[PDB]
From a paper:
In a double-blinded, placebo-controlled phase 1 human clinical trial, the recombinant, germline-targeting envelope glycoprotein (Env) trimer BG505 SOSIP.v4.1-GT1.1, adjuvanted with AS01B, induced bnAb precursors of the VRC01-class at a high frequency in the majority of vaccine recipients. These bnAb precursors, that target the CD4 receptor binding site, had undergone somatic hypermutation characteristic of the VRC01-class. To verify that VRC01-class mAbs elicited by GT1.1 do not just exhibit similar sequence features to VRC01-class bnAbs but also target the CD4bs in a similar manner and with the same atomic contacts, we selected five mAbs for further structural characterization.
Finally, GT1.1-induced VRC01-class mAbs are structurally extremely similar to VRC01-class bnAbs. Hence, some GT1.1-elicited VRC01-class BCRs acquired mutations that confer strong binding to native trimers with intact glycan shields.
Residue numbers in the entry:
A (entry chain H), B (entry chain E): 1 to 52, 52A, 53 to 82, 82A, 82B, 82C, 83 to 100, 100A, ...
C (entry chain F): 4 to 9, 11 to 27, 30 to 91, 96 to 210
D (entry chain L): 3 to 9, 11 to 27, 30 to 91, 96 to 210
The structure:
Amino acid sequence: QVQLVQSGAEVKKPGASVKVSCKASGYTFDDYYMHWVRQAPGQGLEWMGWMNPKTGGVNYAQRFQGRVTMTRDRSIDTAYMELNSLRSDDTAMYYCARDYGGGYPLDFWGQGTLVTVFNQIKGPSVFPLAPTAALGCLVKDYFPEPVTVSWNSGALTSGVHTFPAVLQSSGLYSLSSVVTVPSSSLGTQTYICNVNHKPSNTKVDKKVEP
Amino acid sequence: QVQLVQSGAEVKKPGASVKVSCKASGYTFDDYYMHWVRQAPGQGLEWMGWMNPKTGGVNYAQRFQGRVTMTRDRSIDTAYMELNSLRSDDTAMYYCARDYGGGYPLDFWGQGTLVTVFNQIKGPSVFPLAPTAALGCLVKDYFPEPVTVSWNSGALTSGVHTFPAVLQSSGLYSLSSVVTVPSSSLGTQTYICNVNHKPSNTKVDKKVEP
Amino acid sequence: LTQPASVSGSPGQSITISCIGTSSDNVSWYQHHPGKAPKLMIYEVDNRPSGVSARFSGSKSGNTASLTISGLQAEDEADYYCSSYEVFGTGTKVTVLGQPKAAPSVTLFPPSSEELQANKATLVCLISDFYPGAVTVAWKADSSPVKAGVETTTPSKQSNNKYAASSYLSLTPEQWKSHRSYSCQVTHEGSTVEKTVAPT
Amino acid sequence: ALTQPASVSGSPGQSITISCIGTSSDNVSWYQHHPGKAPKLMIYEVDNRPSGVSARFSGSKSGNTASLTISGLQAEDEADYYCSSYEVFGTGTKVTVLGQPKAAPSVTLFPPSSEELQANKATLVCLISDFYPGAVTVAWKADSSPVKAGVETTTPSKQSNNKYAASSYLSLTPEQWKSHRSYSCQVTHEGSTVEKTVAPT
């Protein structure tokens, strides 16, 4: 029988590092590649990479290069996967899976681990939304609610609609606020969005221009 | 025309104080009482109290006594409602409405003010749940997720069910974990529940007894 | 006070709102449209304020007061609270069912130049002014449906009794410039509306 | 981008098929994933079966679209099913099996603890579990008169035994806990109601 046992579930702060172990039994650990796959919160399976145990060569996905390092210890037939600078998105289920030969037929998945990355106080990232025309400001990746957006320091109140926030899979909030202005004043009057996030003590002014 | 203009929307930290203005125009400010009514975050209206502007006497609801200070400035015909040490439950819409006599025809309700009290990183208040029987622990008022619960330093793992947390009106989380043990061992072996809330760095142990 | 959690009907159904546990005399009703302060509908039992419609009428049956609306107009949907002395009711979610359907309005924004200067690329697809509140959002990259990194909020009430929702697509800057256009498709009551943006 | 249906429903013997749109020729793999345990491979390449897997699972390819046919939906074969062509998997399909044995709920109610009462707080915890399906109504009564304020109920969720559990919390001041005679938690499930009553002893 072939068994793969993974480390215990861990909860980590953002910016910390988590190393998940994966001990192999019932087969020669060197003769098969070891892939690592996520599950994401409510999303689908995601391929992280693979590591040749016999030589140590590692291949990583283009979205994880520079953040993930896969090592192994042949003395105890175990593999490792480490994530550095954990983000709010990184909370997921991490599985180690054995590759039968080349290509990509998968054989076993072990048990999986839960690496929960809790949310911290974060300031929003405010970006413009270039353009009767509509222009606005994007308020992305802030925690927790609420945020306050005022245009031209409260002077512009007509045609302003600030849509309710969305709870992303990471757990952070994102919000948008757009205003409706005549098309003849685009290159004429500046439109500034004043965003306030008191929980993070963040006051930001951004200029919306075409 | 009779109008009641209220102050702007305010966001406050827990423990802070908020004062809401209500300036009356178009009628004699002295001849009519001024009530203050909440809306709650998605719940129904909730009466706080009423104030006599002619005499200065006030009457508060039993659940707000010692917390709300209603005062008026008859010079400019304005009424004020002050909430001291805002809790996470205090995020709601606040309205001022005028009335008279024992009857309650609250004719004008002003405009309203949105007071938002953001959730803070708080550790859980662990309480015991005294009792084939079942005993457990209450994990109340923690934010944000997650919390880890173990019994007897992980020695007890049979018949343990840690229910998913509930998102209350305040925005905090409450969770419960229980263990099922034979009824003959209540007076023989103790029971300790260990609750971990890493975001607030809280580790608490409690003993559950009948 | 005890009130129904929600009542349902249609234009002309004329649903009556119950108010259990009230004492004799001095019963008032309030209509609260979200986003605005509530207004008085019934003075005491059956009286009406000047300027309010006669379509709203109140009555009392000794121990329980009630409010009758002769015709459920498309304008008259709100939370209703009956108050005896200084305590209101539970709140009735008075919803309609025969209302005309309103097609959604979709606005799509490509990732900003500033955001692209931080290795981030997000597409904002804002939906507004649609009834009822049920829209399906699908993203397509040059016709290929894409689901990874899509966050769509649940629809919410506006100040004009219509619904609004927002859909976001998180992308890396490399995959934003590789495709020729990204499309936000929103389907509402069978009729779909589509907006496309390009790296320009 | 391999596209799978969001969810599929059936019953014993329904014999539903899961579609895997957008797959290339050859090298199509299917994985069955019961949450809380590692996913297990079911189909190697289009139609091959690992030793020890059930013949109930068979795969096929209709030119460009892969598919996973199950001969008869057993009440156990409920899970998320993913199709992978090389390293990228599908959206995932929520397989739900119907006609499953309905289970009566089990309810435990705890009065406010002594420590919590010494904090001017009072919480009643009504914990429900081991009921199928996950459709229950929780009502709080105080001396026969229902109470609605200060009630927060979580949505029922899957357990480790494929049954549903939900928890309900009633928040009160200490004065109203002692003044009343008994607070009761009533949960209705498929036409039968289960009641648990506590009091200030």
